[PDB]
Design an enzyme around this catalytic site. Structure first.
Site, PDB file in Angstrom:
ATOM      1  CB  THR A 204       6.425 -90.895   8.681  1.00 19.14           C
ATOM      2  OG1 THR A 204       7.155 -90.099   7.732  1.00 19.14           O
ATOM      3  CG2 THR A 204       4.984 -90.964   8.267  1.00 19.14           C
TER       4      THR A 204
ATOM      5  CG  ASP B 231       9.949 -96.959   5.641  1.00 13.49           C
ATOM      6  OD1 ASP B 231      10.769 -96.290   6.302  1.00 13.49           O
ATOM      7  OD2 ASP B 231       9.389 -96.554   4.599  1.00 13.49           O
TER       8      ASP B 231
END
Lengths: 502, 503, 503, 503
Positions: A76, A43
């Site tokens: 992101t 992540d």
């Protein structure tokens, strides 16, 4: 000159510490803190929030690039990769004496044109809903260690979001306070399941309370079940030995009464955010009430939504209108632990996912992965359209900026062409990561898009440029717009700074 | 301690150093500075006053130049960078005269003669106009070298719009209290998402869920005190001898909160904005009665709200009569970004508006707010004065040309000082050239010719790559900020020039 | 921070190191490890979960392998050492593939394909049986490499006996709550002195000498609160103005304790097990009335006793009605070793038993208890599942042979990973060979042949010095523990294999 | 000191580390290493023997692998990198077997069986040919991954040309003394400027200006001693009592030098190459007489010149008879680059040639010379043996396939070692894949198929991006270098594998 040279290099450094985690052949990062805490993840939001960046340029790159507006899929990581590209390319242009203000205008424009290309080339989700969303959720899981069970987890992600999604103006709205995600180790990743209800990781407060209550009338409190001490300074004055008894009696009676009120209104279950006095625990138990204490506020909010209860802070003023409803509340053992499952809620658009993994650090990453999937399918359902992955949509945008540059000729044009080269950082990362030849894949990729192949991308498995939608590798339209949005702001911010002072 | 030459050359060197620190922020092509501390952390701004206020200046002489960031009349927009850069140049140009043998006092006299003249020339050449169009040109110019994106024309319009909304006319003159324009920000992205609200926006949510999301035809109570249990000043202790008393005492409290709410209801108020806290039991009964309450409201907001709604800020609830209640058509809570804010609209007094800025990054919404605030100030000043000046170094170029002549009409020593002051003014047009990346030396040569041919409005043009007409491009500077930037510079340069010993 | 190759080779090296730390505990011929701290001190165990939970692992990657000691489904018996040793081998075998140029993700995919297949093969080959005889063989096998002496058959029997006593049938299926089997230990020597009690054994003596040594037909009161003087919540102060009052106050206390005991007597209780303390005056009157009382009883025991006797744990004595009392034929105190423990027998609920372990040394009774607990778990699991597997590396050998073939039915890259997973499984049979002191290389050669000739049950035999039929020797492994040991190993190996940078 | 496992794992790790240091120099796409010291300084080479000879290896086990740089039979071209990389792989592959429980000696026996077989297979599959065309293909291949520019075909031709010039036939066999090929370099740029001279080139200028620039039909005297004033062994002191004697003594010296030159002239020599110095007076009279003299000639050159011209190296000038003089058509001095060198051409013996390399940079002319020397060696070997092998990992792939089968025809333990040796051979084709930047894993898969279909000549092709026919591309390896690279690797791997303790 130098403040810039340094700021830019600090920034690019962050871009590269994340680059290898992009995609189906992406790797993860192990992040160990000073306190010794360990987080192993793919992540990009966790990696960034985790890494200890010192340089002020790096701190900003992290903050701005965070795609903060939403954390759907790999927005992101994609943003960060493009920011590093945009910055590295600006370095060159500056070596040629192109004023940073031209570059910032060029980037701003190319950014706008790029959002446009996406809206244009996007694709609305049609009668294909179920199949599309599944393919989307799988693509996401494909990057993670959860790939291992992508088909089952994708189904769970689809079922869950579909259950809580409200089709309002012919449009879809997904409220995440209807999706309770809970993790428990001691089970395989396959043991992960979707429960129609709200699971709360807590057990009954007293051993003598029931393990199950059918047709539950749930009291949700926000106050503790204890004696209330006046606000003004108070002292009992005992001059008669006989009053000592009458006093303790009055106290226990106050607690006995509190329970009587809750029970008088029909309450069957009592769930509090605060504490429950030992004597109150006795009384509830004796009244046959299932009570749980010190519940998470977030858990409280979700229970209110699903049962339709109102969180009360004034027990004295509690009423039946305040009670929530559920077909059954029951304590069940999940592995080692005991949890409370509130099933068959009043509000049926309330669901839970019990994430399993054998190990703690495994189950942690599974929840991270599943929470990603939920946001992917939910934002696709909400947006209504999707764009092809595999670097297809980026190769397209790159293609379409090289045109537009020649229309907006001049010095701006150089910044716009550089912006295109930067977007190509995505297909490069993907190729590099899968073990393919970047310079080779890139040339073929440009060819296909020149010849109008909008959806052509990098199939990292076969290592061939194909149709990304046919192959199912697709993403919400939102991921790309935000990523290019965050990426250009992060780069413009560093490009404008010519000095760093304390 | 340093005496004479060593003390002076040193002071001048210091002044120049701090000017260099802000130099590149001047103009449409200004750069930003990143200021980093220890705890709070990073600040990125183009604002010169911000940069200097934050800077960790060590040297005393530099601490003196930095004081210009606090002269409210100068520290708006490029006023600060203009004053600092000019002080630096005035001190630099002086050094030459000190070297020749000119006394620091005659140099100070020259500068006084020069600045007094300049202040006259600019009132002479000042362009009049209260034209909303010019106001817009003031804002566009004020927002020029900031990281605001392309939304400038959109922002400029908001500014003029807000300014014209609260602007009022006293005896024949327009007065604009900027304090009536409530500017706030919220991280939601877009910028074009900035809103202009005809009311007061309050970054506060209603205290209790069960309270209405919207109140129409609101009778607003502004309260100073906490809606909590108050203990007497002289210590008090409660003594219970009867077990039965304990309940009663516990009840007096409840009833106390019940009465608080009764008083409020009796006045007709249906909204309660409290500057302090509200007990949970009070929140209970307020919600029960349907009153919308907000707590811990900032005093600044309490005051703006009293201003906008006509409400009297009351401390003793017994003096909560319908006479002290404010009015507004709507009091509604609505989610902005991730927060829930309270919107008080259709206030009794129309001369109150809010601007809710959006922009994402956080570090951008801050400068944008920083920008919009300066813009509001400059537009407000001009609205009042009705006069402005041409930008891009046009004013300085005119001044430099005229003072160069006025010098001749003056005696020897002073004349030298006045020619030095005239040269110093060129530091502005040169700084804009350098920042834009164009040739300083040739831009000045061209600029001088055109202003001498009578082209008063010719400033430095990035586009034309050199000089150009600011009248056409619309680059305008407010007057007040100019005169004070010159005056500040002179007063401070003189203070420093006069020191011959630092102990 | 480490990147790429350096990061990976390092992580693998770490995993291997921690596996080595437990390796020798595998099997009937397992060794013990002595773990020494600072204050508490020495722990000697063969249990892999204990060893890892105690170990002072520094490296992060090693802290991850150690997490397997907490996966309740794996950490029972040799499950822990099997999972850790296998992760080590899976990572070791991977290193070769990484060297050749295989991507960590296809290696992870291979392992997933392999483990999913293996999980299928073992359910296919799993042997069914709920035969008490097999249960005994499960326990005997579970107690194999521990320092329990020769009493194993005696212990194994206790286990099956306890398990079958609390095992119950829900809808068609047998569920066994191990929490109903109370295991405790006492240093008295012998081991054969371990007893199987049909009731709850409590390491607590009766509070007062004058209380009966044995109570028959007991009506047991379980009490939550302290039988002590309770002070009010709101502060209270007593004021005496009459010298005569002092006695009265001193008496109200006595009478308070007298009533406590009256309430208890009124319910018909003749035994009182208190979770908290009991004042000396209360002990006085309890003994006076003939009630047998124990105090400061553990909550765990309070709960087991409520379970066994049907008693309701009561906090407010006023709710001490005959309805909340539990029943047992006998409550007797009897000296065990050097202590005096309370025995609650002939409980209302038969599904509750205790095992009082004896063994002397202290450091032996602890592992023996540690042993009996695992044994109880494995026997309990099997009782439920009804299926088991052959021991001694028989399962792994079958799996290694089959997956070696299944690999061929798979594509290039994955095939490599699956052949690597097949080799990794051989680390178990090899570890048993090495530990027993026999030739690893030749045992494997023989083992492979026999399982390929279809001899599924051939594992490593110490006696036959090489391979042998486990069916005859009776070495059996529970199923659940096997599948989870494989699954844990794979999930953890993948987590680590995927890291390319440690910051 | 380290014992057992620790000693062995460590030794293997060391061997692998040094192999990694040269790995990337393998092939047409080899990289260079920059080696920097303290005084002399920087060396940039692709030559593996050079790199290892220079490297500062610390570890003993690594000092042992480095010894392969001195095995003259292996250290030519890629022979060194092949032997080192293979030892590393043989030790690496062994580690696995040691882990399983295989004894270091049976592993050593396996490798011996394997290498003996391989040595047989390659003589079987060796391709015969003395075809000048193949010689050229040997050189082209030898010059492949060096920084020589594009001039390779031009260089390759020089090599074959030089080799065929000095190659001679003894009893039926061709023997080529490379020592007859004088290779030298001079910084003048171009490379294509390299010349092939039929004579001996000497980096020495004529001692005196007045000496002829060119001598035709030269009778060459090779002299061992210095043409200087020699003092007796037993100390001698001159005593002058007559002032007149001083001149005489000063004259005896002159006359001594005059006679030296007379002796030389008397033999008919017209060129004098002296290994030592020549006094200025001797130079005077030599020039006077027209003799061309060079002094301080290297012994190596003295010897090559005696070889080429048939001259006898004489020490005592009295033994300077016409019988000991050498012959050459021309002795000429000519400026090469910035120096003036002496060219002795048309020597009595035709079997002597020189190659004057040019190339500029200095650091390039050195490697180019380094290159041309290896090339000369390989071409010379092949000229002799008449046999060669296909390049690009073709040989290793064949060997790996065959030994994989031959393993089956062998007993258990050894079989394992032989399968390990077969895997080790793949490290070469894989290293070429990796260096070229292509996928290692897939190239091997393809390579294996083709050689198994009988395509012996299929090696790794950069162009075809994967495998391809080396027969067509012309990549050929000499035989001798192959067999010795395998043999060295095995002998050294065994030495190291056998150590169980380092003290």
């Amino acid at each position: 000159k130098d403040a810039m040279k340094e700021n830019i290099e600090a920034a690019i450094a962050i871009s590269n510490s994340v680059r290898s985690s992009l995609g189906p052949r992406g790797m993860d990062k192990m992040l160990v803190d000073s306190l010794g805490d360990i987080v192993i993840t793919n992540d990009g939001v966790t990696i960034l929030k985790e890494m200890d960046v010192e340089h002020p340029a790096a701190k900003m790159m992290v903050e701005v690039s965070k795609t903060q507006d939403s954390f759907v899929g790999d927005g992101t990581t994609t943003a960060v990769i493009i920011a590093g590209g945009l910055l590295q390319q600006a370095q060159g242009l500056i070596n040629q004496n192109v004023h940073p203000t031209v570059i910032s205008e060029g980037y701003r424009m190319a950014s706008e044109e790029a959002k446009r290309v996406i809206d244009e080339i996007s694709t609305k989700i049609g009668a294909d809903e179920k199949a599309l969303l599944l393919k989307m959720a799988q693509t996401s899981l494909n990057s993670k260690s959860a790939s291992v069970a992508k088909d089952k987890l994708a189904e769970i992600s689809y079922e869950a979001v579909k259950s809580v999604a409200e089709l309002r103006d012919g449009k879809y709205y997904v409220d995440f306070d209807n999706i309770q995600v809970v993790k428990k180790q001691g089970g395989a990743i396959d043991d992960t399941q979707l429960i129609n209800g709200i699971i709360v990781d807590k057990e009954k407060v007293h051993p003598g309370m029931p393990d199950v209550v059918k047709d539950a009338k749930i009291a949700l409190l926000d106050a503790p079940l204890e004696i209330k001490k006046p606000e003004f300074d108070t002292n009992l004055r005992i001059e008669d030995p006989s009053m000592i008894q009458k006093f303790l009696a009055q106290e226990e009676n106050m607690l006995r009464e509190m329970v009587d009120k809750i029970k008088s209104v029909g309450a069957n279950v009592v769930i509090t955010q605060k504490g429950i006095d030992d004597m109150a625990q006795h009384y509830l138990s004796r009244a046959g009430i299932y009570a749980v204490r010190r519940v998470k506020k977030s858990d409280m909010d979700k229970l209110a939504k699903a049962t339709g209860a109102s969180i009360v802070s004034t027990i004295d003023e509690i009423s039946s209108s305040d009670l929530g409803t559920a077909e059954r509340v029951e304590q069940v053992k999940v592995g080692e632990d005991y949890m409370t499952f509130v099933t068959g809620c009043k509000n049926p658009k309330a669901v839970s996912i019990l994430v399993r993994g054998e190990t703690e650090h495994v189950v942690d990453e599974m929840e991270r992965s599943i929470t990603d999937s939920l946001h992917v399918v939910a934002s696709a359902l909400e947006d209504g359209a999707y764009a092809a992955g595999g670097g297809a949509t980026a190769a397209e945008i790159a293609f379409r900026l090289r045109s537009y540059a020649q229309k907006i000729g001049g010095r701006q044009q150089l910044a716009i062409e550089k912006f295109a080269d930067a977007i190509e950082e995505i297909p490069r990362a993907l190729a590099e990561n899968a073990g393919l030849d970047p310079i080779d894949i890139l040339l073929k990729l440009r060819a296909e898009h020149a010849k109008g192949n909008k959806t052509y991308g990098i199939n990292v498995f076969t290592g061939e440029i194909e149709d990304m939608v046919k192959n199912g590798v697709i993403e919400p339209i939102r991921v790309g717009k935000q990523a290019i949005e965050s990426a250009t702001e992060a780069a413009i911010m560093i490009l404008r700074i010519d000095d760093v002072i304390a | 301690r340093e005496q004479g030459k060593n003390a002076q050359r040193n002071n001048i060197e210091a002044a120049k150093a701090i000017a260099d620190a802000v130099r590149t922020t001047l103009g449409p092509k200004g750069m930003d500075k990143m200021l980093v501390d220890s705890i709070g952390d990073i600040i990125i701004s183009n604002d010169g006053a911000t940069i200097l206020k934050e800077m960790d200046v060590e040297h005393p002489t530099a601490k003196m130049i930095v004081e210009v960031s606090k002269a409210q009349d100068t520290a708006v927009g490029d006023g600060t960078t203009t004053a600092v850069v000019l002080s630096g140049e005035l001190l630099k140009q002086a050094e030459t005269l000190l070297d020749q043998g000119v006394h620091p006092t005659v140099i100070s006299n020259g500068y006084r003669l020069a600045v007094n003249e300049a202040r006259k020339i600019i009132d002479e050449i000042a362009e009049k106009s209260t034209d909303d169009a010019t106001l817009r040109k003031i804002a566009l110019t004020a927002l020029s070298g900031k990281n605001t994106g392309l939304s400038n024309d959109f922002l400029a319009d908001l500014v003029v719009k807000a300014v014209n909304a609260v602007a009022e006319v006293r005896d024949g003159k327009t007065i604009v209290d900027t304090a009536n324009i409530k500017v706030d920000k919220k991280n939601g992205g877009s910028v074009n998402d900035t809103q202009f609200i005809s009311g007061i926006v309050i970054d506060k949510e209603k205290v209790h869920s069960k309270m209405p999301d919207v109140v129409k035809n609101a009778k607003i109570a502004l309260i100073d005190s906490a809606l909590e249990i108050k203990k007497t000043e002289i210590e008090a202790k409660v003594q219970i001898s009867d077990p039965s008393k304990i309940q009663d005492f516990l009840n007096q409290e409840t009833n106390t909160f019940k009465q608080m709410v009764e008083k409020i209801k009796k006045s007709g108020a249906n909204v309660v904005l409290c500057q302090k806290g509200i007990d949970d039991v009070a929140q209970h009964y307020l919600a029960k009665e349907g009153i919308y309450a907000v707590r811990r409201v900032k005093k600044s907001d309490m005051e703006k709200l009293a201003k906008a709604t006509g409400a009297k800020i009351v401390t003793d609830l017994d003096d909560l009569t319908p006479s002290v209640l404010g009015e507004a058509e709507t009091v509604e809570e609505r989610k902005i970004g991730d927060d829930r804010m309270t919107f008080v609209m259709g206030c009794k007094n129309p001369k109150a508006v809010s601007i809710l800025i959006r922009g994402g990054t956080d570090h951008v919404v801050s400068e944008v707010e920083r920008a919009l605030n300066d813009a509001i100030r400059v537009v407000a000043i001009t609205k009042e004065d009705g006069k402005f000046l041409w930008g891009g170094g046009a004013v300085e170029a005119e001044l430099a040309m005229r003072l160069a002549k006025y010098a001749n009409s003056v005696g020897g020593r002073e004349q030298l000082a006045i020619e030095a002051f005239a040269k110093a003014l060129e530091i502005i047009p040169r700084t804009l050239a350098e920042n834009a990346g164009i040739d300083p030396i040739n831009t000045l040569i061209k600029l001088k010719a055109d202003d001498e041919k009578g082209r008063i409005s010719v400033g430095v043009d990035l586009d034309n790559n050199g000089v150009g007409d600011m009248k056409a491009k619309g680059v305008v500077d407010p007057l007040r900020v100019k005169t004070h930037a010159l005056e500040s510079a002179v007063e401070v340069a003189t203070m420093i020039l006069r020191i011959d010993d630092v102990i």
